[PDB]
Amino acid sequence: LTESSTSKFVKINEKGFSDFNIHYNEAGNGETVIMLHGGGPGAGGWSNYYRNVGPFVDAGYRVILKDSPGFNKSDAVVMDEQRGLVNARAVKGLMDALDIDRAHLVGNAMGGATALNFALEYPDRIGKLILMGPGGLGPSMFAPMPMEGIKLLFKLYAEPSYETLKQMLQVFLYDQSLITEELLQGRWEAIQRQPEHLKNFLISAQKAPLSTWDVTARLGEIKAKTFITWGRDDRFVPLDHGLKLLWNIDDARLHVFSKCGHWAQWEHADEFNRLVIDFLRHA
Amino acid sequence: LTESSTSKFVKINEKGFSDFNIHYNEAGNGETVIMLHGGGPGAGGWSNYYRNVGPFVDAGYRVILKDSPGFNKSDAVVMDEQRGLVNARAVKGLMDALDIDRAHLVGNAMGGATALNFALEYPDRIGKLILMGPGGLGPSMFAPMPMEGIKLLFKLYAEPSYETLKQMLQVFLYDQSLITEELLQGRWEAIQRQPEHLKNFLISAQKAPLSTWDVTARLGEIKAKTFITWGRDDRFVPLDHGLKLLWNIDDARLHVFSKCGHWAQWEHADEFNRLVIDFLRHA
Amino acid sequence: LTESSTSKFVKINEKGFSDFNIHYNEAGNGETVIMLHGGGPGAGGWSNYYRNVGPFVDAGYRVILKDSPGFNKSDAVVMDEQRGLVNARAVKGLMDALDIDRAHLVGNAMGGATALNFALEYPDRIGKLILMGPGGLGPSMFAPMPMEGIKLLFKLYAEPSYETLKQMLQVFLYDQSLITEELLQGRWEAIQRQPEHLKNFLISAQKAPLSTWDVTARLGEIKAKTFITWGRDDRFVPLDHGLKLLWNIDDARLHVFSKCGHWAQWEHADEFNRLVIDFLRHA
Amino acid sequence: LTESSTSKFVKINEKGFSDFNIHYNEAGNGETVIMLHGGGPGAGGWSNYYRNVGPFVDAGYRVILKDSPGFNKSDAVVMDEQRGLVNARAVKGLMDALDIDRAHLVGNAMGGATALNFALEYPDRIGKLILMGPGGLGPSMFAPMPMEGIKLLFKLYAEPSYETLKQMLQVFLYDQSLITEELLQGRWEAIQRQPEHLKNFLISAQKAPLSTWDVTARLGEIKAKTFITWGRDDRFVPLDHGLKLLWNIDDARLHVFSKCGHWAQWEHADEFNRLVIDFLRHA
Ligand SMILES: O=C([O-])C(=O)/C=C/CC(=O)c1ccccc1
Ligand SMILES: O=C([O-])C(=O)/C=C/CC(=O)c1ccccc1
């Protein structure tokens, strides 16, 4: 499986989206799992999930790594509403266009917020819900906010550079020795290729601050079986929000990885894959 | 598999144990997993683990459900040292007598303390370490101590009655509707059959208070891959000790079950079994 | 100062209250501080606050220890709405009847919920806000709910007895040696004197469960300078809600007392008095 | 009161210190309060405490703002043992040289660690113990370590610059608008004036890593009445260590300030002063 060989585009039409181009990477043919990426500069479906797509497809799933609006090879957009909800509308437009009735969701950070809004807005269109450090869930009980990683992500958005990209990647990972020239170069390419995405994200953040993303009050509505994952060492989204979700969602469990940065799906790919596949199969 | 058909006895000789009778239930023939029970009145290997033994044996493990000294059908004892360490000596004596060189351990509460002391004292004799609400790890950062469940466990030790047994079982479970006459009767039988165990436990607790059980300071020595499990709704041992372990043990992960009392292995048996088996196979 | 000599009654008329009798104890003549009691059986203004009224009056405050509707010598009531809000309406009716334009509030548990609803509903009628283990603020991130103390409080409501009263008082206090025959007798008298209050509270709880009391989502509206106090060892309302308030209210501080049960105002009266008086004078 | 007019030097002789020059600022003549500063580059007694010295002296205390070895105008040193203990030896040498039998201590961060070691090593030489974000107390239950602020403090030590100094000061404060040219210039002067202190601190940190500073296991020995303070928004030392202390020290209380960085004594000087003075007078 490669980015090139899985790469697809589809036009969506859904509340506020008109003939809007969505890029995604797709493989496999069984039950659909849509994976949704974080909101850092250069983020995209393949970049965030290339260690997971293979094992999920081997397990029998149809995997769609979606580029959210205003990221990677999806169309540029300036959003005046909180991104979780707008992104969720885009997931529904994608599913409608592809004739997918129900999907399991996997969401990292901004993608976790997307997945939560999707589950809230379209409960008949979701299977299982998998959340990896979901963002926007209001204040932490322990962590000063904005968190260290979020500050760096905004710095990179405003002043993109390879050095600042490196710094950010150093804070994303517990084990900085895992940061290869290849990982850096790939993220830098997504940044260099679509500078407008960076400008638009900052404009959107002024229109709809992070507090507007907080869906905490509605967590009780979620009936999807939910699997919450967190890196113990996540410097981007606070560990105690893993507990907030576990207490507020009806059917949830929480798995926390030791020696693990924000990207549990990448830094602990093997264990992440086995747990999530098991959950999809047996929970 | 039944209690009767798996029931075995063996004499142990180890530091402070002389021709000391240990009861255990054993089945299967592959890699050894010794499961270690909690410290409440009536506790024993079969009682705590009868929902787990079958699936672990089906998975290919040799399962030994051990009765710790001063519980169930093991010999009565008054302990002047912290129970985790004394119990761990008993596990080593059992393994020595059965010619078992290395075992994976699963430990609930008092059994979790046992498993931690075993890993500390005999690091060459342990495989993987599985901890389910381990007790004795010092103060909670949030929970007033003694915890509600611990108070009830001491009340039952001092004044055993079927009513107080019922109360305790109600606090052990998140879903009290899961408390059958059969579960009650079985725990009550272990209490009625060996009243001396109750007296001796209380005497032991006066000699060696819970603070003596705290091995927090030595957690950094543990090299066993460790899987920590907790019920979100555990009223016996505090949820934040799951985090204490995750931060202090080198290679650990933490799984917390929603809508789950202290006994995650019983209340969430299916998920518990799948996760722990997966961990033993693949971690 | 005595209960008898401070005892007053006033009729209130406010949204849903018609010629409704409120009992209170009043002393002093400077700025008004209304203290609001917890929701346990037998609770009342004097009982909860008799260690605080003297020092506050010596400091120059007019102190009103209010009996909330359905407690002590206030009129019986069955409430179909969450008690915080209904109680707050009663505080406003009391202030209106006494020609008090603004008051500082001190609220324990149910009284803390009252004080929060008052601050939200009538922001021009409050000075400073003092909260001592306020109840009803939704789930804890650590504590299984209902908490141990809340279970006991409901047990006493349903089956009042002097023994169960004693048990409850034992769980309220960190230092059980502080429980005198006098304290017990006084609480028991309030229970014996108005059995109907007990029945009505249980009926009200069925109509308006604790989740209906959660005003977390509105905490951002509070502009009152706020002083949050908690007993470290509170078995009735969870310590982490002290942090929830500190993060969600604009101008707040949190003081936690070691070796202190739920009743910080009683168990640590001297320090409580000095801190709260200082806050009222200088914050 | 000014830095110049309060400035004093004294030679100390104590375990490992021989004719070692200590600088301090002193004023007042009643009970002695020694204030102990943090470990960031440029830190010193006056810099950390100039908003507190006046009010404490007005209150009747003799205030000594001590420069710890290897900071400000105290002698340079390379330490091969954990700094808390070495600093505490220096406090005892200072008290011995000045004929001070007992002192109250106030300690910020590294100074909090100093104060804890002093209380442990010389319990007959301490009055009350005041701790403001004490450092070195082992892992956080929530915060990835090293914390954001600690990373920046090390960066400034290795590559001192006015820009990096500014960055660090921005992370120290909740309200960055409080950072004046005067505060910056004063900290920069302490850095520019003694570059060797910077080199030596980094060498010392290699010899004695932060884990060597953890005295958690001995907290039970402290009999001093203890007042623990924390900024809610402290990005240097984790808020949950405030709870660790409150649970582990016999007679403690915890006060947390909203909208407050690491330096509670500076950012919330007025409230800090009133609380600590009250504690010294009345606790
Ligand atoms: O790959 C990434 O860009 C990634 O993991 C981003 C994480 C942070 C993120 O999207 C976020 C956005 C809003 C609030 C919190 C967090
Ligand atoms: O089955 C049981 O008896 C059980 O799960 C007991 C749990 C509590 C327990 O053994 C314990 C002992 C010491 C400290 C904390 C907890």
Ligand SMILES: O=C([O-])C(=O)/C=C/CC(=O)c1ccccc1
């Ligand atoms: O004196 C008392 O009755 C007292 O302190 C009661 C505390 C518990 C309480 O009123 C409460 C009510 C609802 C939710 C949480 C707590």
Ligand SMILES: O=C([O-])C(=O)/C=C/CC(=O)c1ccccc1
């Ligand atoms: O003024 C300062 O330099 C200050 O507040 C420093 C705080 C951090 C600090 O000294 C520290 C040292 C070791 C571990 C944690 C924290």
Ligand code: NA
């Ligand atoms: Na490498």
Ligand code: NA
């Ligand atoms: Na049934």
Ligand code: NA
């Ligand atoms: Na007495």
Ligand code: NA
């Ligand atoms: Na200014």
